[PDB]
């Protein structure tokens, strides 16, 4: 859709992932702005791109510039949304369709293996996702598994054609030790969600009104009883969710 143009931000983004290991897996791969550099790490790459035309051309441009039918990048006509990511370790990067933003990263983040995430999005969504001025509901949602960068802002003149905002690079890594354990993600999601939408003037009147906490708990975690669920670590949610499941 918005196809990355500003060779600076090619290279931003190929330092980022040159700093991982193992194999990588491009979405919104276009015509190779990404791709073809990512090649010149000489790592196992899948890169995906939706329209099938536009796909058969990245094919032959991978092809030329590889070392050969001998040494080789997979081009994948498909959606994002319905490839299947492999089990085993990998990085993937993407320029992702800011209509699809929110639909892409639940699918990461959701699914396995991957590692680390370098991800192009709106500004808006990434300055969110990153907690910059306070973490928001869904990144809350998923902090005891992920932990989320904001790497660098975006112009929207990087691309051609312009986007009507401005975007982020965002960075994703998912947790060796997760805080929560998977299987009790929906109870912590949901106490995430019941917390940011509970009623009261801060943290202490929001526990009190809801249907799970001792009077001493909150200043016991460093809490400030007038704090903004904004405000709390993953590691203060980790210990909410312990205390009420």
Same mark, same amino acid.
């Given at each position: 859709?918005?196809?990355?143009s500003?060779?600076?931000?090619?290279?931003?983004?190929?330092?980022?992932?040159?700093?991982?290991?193992?194999?990588?897996?491009?979405?919104?791969?276009?015509?190779?702005?990404?791709?073809?550099?990512?090649?010149?790490? /000489?790592?196992?790459?899948?890169?995906? *791109?939706?329209?099938?035309? +536009?796909?058969?051309?990245? #094919?032959?441009? @991978?092809? $030329?510039s590889?070392?050969?039918?001998?040494?080789?990048?997979?081009?994948?006509?498909?959606?994002?949304?319905?490839?299947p990511?492999?089990?085993?370790?990998?990085?993937?990067?993407?320029?992702?369709?800011?209509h699809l933003?929110?639909?892409?990263?639940?699918?990461?983040?959701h699914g396995?293996?991957?590692?680390?995430?370098?991800?192009?999005?709106?500004?808006?969504?990434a300055?969110?996702?990153?907690?910059?001025?306070?973490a928001?509901?869904?990144? /809350?949602?998923?902090?005891?598994?992920? *932990?989320?960068?904001?790497? +660098?802002?975006?112009?929207? #003149?990087?691309? @051609?054609? $312009?986007?009507?905002?401005?975007?982020?690079?965002?960075?994703?890594?998912?947790?060796?030790?997760?805080?929560?354990?998977?299987?009790?993600?929906?109870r912590?999601?949901?106490?995430?969600?019941?917390?940011?939408?509970?009623?009261?003037?801060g943290?202490?009147?929001?526990?009190?009104r809801?249907?799970?906490?001792?009077?001493?708990?909150?200043?016991?975690?460093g809490?400030?009883?007038?704090?903004?669920?904004?405000?709390?670590?993953?590691?203060?949610? /980790?210990?909410?969710?312990?205390?009420?499941?």
């Amino acid at each position: 859709q918005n196809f990355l143009s500003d060779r600076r931000v090619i290279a931003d983004i190929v330092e980022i992932v040159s700093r991982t290991n193992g194999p990588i897996i491009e979405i919104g791969a276009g015509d190779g702005a990404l791709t073809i550099p990512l090649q010149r790490l /000489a790592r196992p790459l899948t890169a995906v *791109e939706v329209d099938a035309r +536009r796909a058969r051309r990245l #094919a032959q441009r @991978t092809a $030329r510039s590889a070392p050969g039918p001998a040494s080789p990048t997979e081009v994948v006509a498909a959606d994002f949304l319905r490839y299947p990511l492999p089990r085993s370790p990998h990085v993937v990067v993407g320029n992702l369709p800011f209509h699809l933003t929110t639909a892409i990263l639940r699918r990461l983040l959701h699914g396995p293996g991957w590692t680390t995430a370098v991800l192009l999005m709106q500004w808006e969504v990434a300055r969110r996702r990153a907690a910059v001025g306070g973490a928001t509901m869904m990144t /809350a949602q998923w902090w005891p598994w992920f *932990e989320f960068g904001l790497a +660098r802002k975006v112009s929207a #003149a990087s691309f @051609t054609p $312009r986007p009507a905002v401005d975007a982020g690079l965002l960075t994703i890594t998912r947790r060796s030790r997760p805080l929560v354990d998977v299987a009790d993600r929906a109870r912590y999601q949901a106490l995430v969600h019941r917390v940011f939408t509970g009623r009261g003037h801060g943290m202490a009147q929001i526990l009190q009104r809801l249907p799970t906490v001792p009077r001493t708990w909150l200043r016991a975690n460093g809490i400030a009883p007038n704090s903004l669920p904004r405000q709390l670590s993953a590691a203060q949610w /980790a210990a909410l969710f312990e205390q009420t499941r």
